[PDB]
């Protein structure tokens, strides 16, 4: 099977003859080939997107919302096909995959509610017989770049707001897991999305993606991915000063205070690390446990970790599937060996799975490291896998300083029944997305917003949607 690219309502090949394979993490089966365009394909799809946007913007916002609501429902109609495709290309549990498809639909349906919230401002002038008008208008062409952990939902997360607001979009999905995203091309056509309003091109992030983000025709970049790629895009955007909405890496601490409910805290900590095989940007990446509850907490928590069943993600008994590819599995092995080198203990796991049920695929054991000090690399380098270091602490001010000792500042989780600890978080905890007495997991109406190198400018909600519009100011005498 070989996919094409969706450009201007047609299916076309990369102008270089290049393809790229897509490999299942479950069994290393080559699932399909995709086009592997390079920088020379950017201008065509941007020009097509530019032309289509002029007509799309003229459509009443209510019609745009009606088309996208149909698009989102067509996605829901094909939930089972798309979920099984996500399981095969990306490796997530089937039940998580079904949840990702639903989130794709709801990300689009949530944005449709903003179809009627684009009013401008009538501003009173200091000068007589004069009016100041501040209109909201589309930016034009949005470039949307996605990551592989939730590729389909990350696309809907950006398609929805961009098209509702009257923009056209050029989606460059991750090259690791683009197949389900490419299938949206056919549903876009079924829903009646006009030709060129939704484009899907596949190719190298550092070639095609880099050409798209700095291009003259690109008015906005919405991108999800690692911090180094986001930094490259920031540099590129100096060439066009396109608005950049970049949602990048995390190193979320999970803090268990002395007065936490240990059973609630342990279950929240368990899911927050091992959801999606650790491949969540809000994951519990470093667990801080107060020394007074350490022993009792860890006995509860470790009983949970040791019962995680790693297996085939179509098997309903599986609690954790494979890692997405060999590069990411190698990263697990290197983080573990390096942590042993700097003095840490491997309490559980810490190796790739052995045995007949796992000779194909990229399988890593749920891993807990102890005797970890704050300065070890595993406390600072994002893991994005099932590796959890555990650090003791003795006071709030101590763990706060640990929490902020980071280049990342996306998620943070804390379990405590002390309301004054929680109130100090507003001014003292340098994370943009804070969970109190529960695990990670954001909502469409929230604001997914990362401090420091976790991004520059948030996503979702009203403050995410508002970034897909531009302003135009009129001084009218």
* Rounded least distance, CB 145 to ligand NAP, Å: 5
**Which residues are within 8 A (CB) of 470 and not within 5 positions of it... i.e. 6 or more apart?**
136, 137, 138, 139, 219
351 sits near its own copies (criterion: CB under 8 A): no
Tell me, yes or no, if 112 is annotated catalytic. Answer: no
Residue 448 found at the interface with its own copies (CB under 8 A): yes
Determine which one of 176, 189, 247, 365 is catalytic: 247
The span of 84-92, 150-158, 171-179, 449-457 binding its own copies (CB under 8 A) equals 449-457
Q: Mind giving me the DSSP string for 353-405?
A: --SGGGSSS--B--EEEES--TTSGGGTS---SSEEEEEEESSHHHHHHHHHS
* CA atoms in the 13 A half-sphere facing the CB of 263: 0
* Binding residue for its own copies, selected from 183, 312, 433, 459, defined by CB under 8 A: 433
Pick 166 or 389: Cβ nearer its own copies: 166
Interaction mask 243-282, its own copies, x per CB under 8 A: x--x------------------------------------
Of positions 297, 385, 461, 465, contacts its own copies by CB under 8 A = 461
Helix ranges, 91-224 (H): 94-112, 151-164, 179-191, 210-213
247 is an active site residue: yes
Q: Is 171 helix (H, G, I), strand (E, B) or coil?
A: strand
Considering the rule CB under 6 A, would residue 148 count as an interface residue with ligand NAP? yes
Binding-site member from 52, 242, 255, 390 for its own copies (CB under 8 A): 242
Angstrom distance (rounded) from CA 236 to CA 441 = 31
- Rounded CA-CA distance 458/465 in Å is 10
Shortest separation between residue 438's beta carbon and its own copies, angstroms? 4
Q: Which of 30, 134, 330, 337 binds its own copies (CB under 8 A)?
A: 134
Nearer to its own copies, 21 or 441 (CB): 441
At CB < 8 A and 24+ separation, what contacts does 394-402 make? Answer: 394/290, 394/291, 396/257, 396/421, 396/424, 399/253, 399/255, 399/288, 399/290, 400/424, 400/428, 400/429, 402/253, 402/288, 402/374
Q: Which of residues 208-267 bind ligand NAP (CB under 6 A)?
A: 209-210, 213, 224-226, 229, 232-233, 247-250
Tell me the sheet residues that pair with 412.
Answer: 434
Closer residue to its own copies (CB): 81 or 474? 474
Minimum distance of its own copies from residue 205's CB (angstroms)? 16
Is 60 one of the binding residues for its own copies (CB under 8 A)? Answer: no
Outline where 165-226 has alpha helix (H): 179-191, 210-213
Question: Under the criterion CB under 6 A, does residue 86 sit at the interface with ligand NAP?
Answer: no
Distance CA 420, CA 255 (A): 15
Among 17, 60, 124, 356, interactor with its own copies by CB under 8 A: 124
Q: Considering only residues 442-461, where is the footprint of ligand NAP by CB under 6 A?
A: 448, 450, 454-455
Of 249, 169, 171, nearest to 205 (Cα)? Answer: 171
Matching residue, tokens 């790739």: 352
Locate all alpha helices (DSSP H) within 203-309, ordered by sequence.
210-213, 227-237, 262-274, 294-306
H or E element that contains 35: strand 30-35
**237 interacts with its own copies by CB under 8 A:** yes
Which position among 112, 281, 283, 415 bears the catalytic label? 281
Residues that bind ligand NAP (rule: CB under 6 A) add up to a total of 33
Gaps in the chain (C–N > 2.5 Å) come after which residues? Answer: none
The H or E element containing residue 348 is strand 345-348
- Name the one range near ligand NAP by CB under 6 A: 41-49, 126-134, 206-214, 352-360: 206-214
133, 160 in Cβ contact below 8 A?
no
Binding test (CB under 6 A) with ligand NAP, winner from 6, 274, 288, 384: 384
Interface residues toward ligand NAP, by CB under 6 A: 145-149, 172, 174-176, 204-206, 209-210, 213, 224-226, 229, 232-233, 247-250, 281, 382, 384, 410, 448, 450, 454-455
Interface residues toward its own copies, by CB under 8 A: 57, 121, 123-126, 130, 132, 134-135, 137, 230-232, 234-235, 237-243, 246, 422, 425-427, 431-438, 441-443, 445-449, 451-458, 461-463, 470-477
The catalytic residues are: 247, 281
């Amino acid at each position: 099977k070989q996919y094409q690219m969706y450009v201007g309502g047609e299916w076309i090949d990369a102008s270089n003859g290049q393809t790229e394979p897509v490999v299942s993490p479950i069994n290393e089966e080559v699932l399909a080939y995709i086009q592997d365009a390079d920088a020379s394909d950017a201008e065509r799809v941007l020009a097509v997107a530019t032309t289509a946007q002029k007509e799309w913007a003229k459509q009443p916002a209510r019609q745009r919302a009606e088309v996208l609501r149909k698009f989102a429902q067509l996605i829901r109609d094909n939930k089972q096909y798309l979920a099984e495709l996500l399981v095969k290309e990306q490796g997530k549990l089937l039940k998580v995959a079904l949840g990702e498809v639903e989130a794709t639909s709801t990300f689009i349906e949530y944005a449709c509610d903003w179809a009627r919230q684009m009013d401008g401002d009538i501003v009173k002038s200091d000068n007589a017989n004069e009016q100041i008008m501040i209109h909201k208008i589309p930016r034009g062409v949005v470039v949307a770049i996605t990551a592989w952990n939730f590729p389909l939902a990350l696309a809907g997360r950006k398609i929805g707001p961009a098209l509702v607001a009257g923009n056209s979009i050029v989606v460059k999905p991750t090259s690791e897991t683009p197949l389900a995203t490419l299938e949206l091309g056919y549903l876009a056509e079924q829903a009646g999305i006009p030709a060129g309003v939704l484009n899907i091109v596949t190719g190298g992030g550092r070639t095609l993606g880099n050409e798209l983000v700095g291009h003259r025709m690109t008015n906005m970049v919405s991108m999800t991915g690692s911090t180094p790629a986001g930094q490259s895009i920031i540099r590129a955007s100096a060439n066009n000063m396109a608005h950049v909405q970049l949602e990048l890496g995390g190193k979320a601490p999970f803090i268990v205070m002395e007065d936490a409910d240990l059973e609630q805290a342990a279950a929240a900590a368990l899911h927050s690390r091992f959801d999606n095989c650790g491949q969540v940007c809000t994951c519990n990446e470093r667990m801080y446990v107060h020394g007074a509850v350490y022993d009792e907490f860890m006995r509860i928590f470790m009983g949970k970790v040791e019962a995680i069943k790693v297996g085939d993600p179509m098997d309903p008994a599986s609690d954790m599937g494979p890692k997405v590819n060999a590069n990411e599995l190698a990263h697990m092995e290197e983080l573990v060996a390096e942590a042993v080198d700097e003095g840490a203990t491997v309490l559980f796991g810490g190796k790739k799975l052995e045995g007949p049920e796992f000779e194909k695929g990229f399988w890593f054991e749920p891993t807990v490291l102890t005797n970890v000090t704050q300065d070890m690399t595993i406390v600072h380098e994002e893991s994005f896998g099932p590796i959890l270091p555990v650090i003791k602490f003795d006071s709030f001010d101590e763990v706060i300083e640990y929490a902020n000792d980071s280049d990342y500042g996306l998620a943070a989780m804390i379990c405590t029944q002390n309301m004054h600890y929680i109130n100090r978080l507003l001014t003292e905890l340098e994370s943009g997305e804070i969970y109190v007495n529960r695990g990670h997991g954001e909502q469409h109406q929230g604001f997914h917003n990362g401090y420091k190198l976790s991004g520059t400018g948030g996503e979702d909600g009203k403050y995410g949607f508002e970034q897909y519009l531009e302003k135009k100011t009129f001084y009218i005498n």
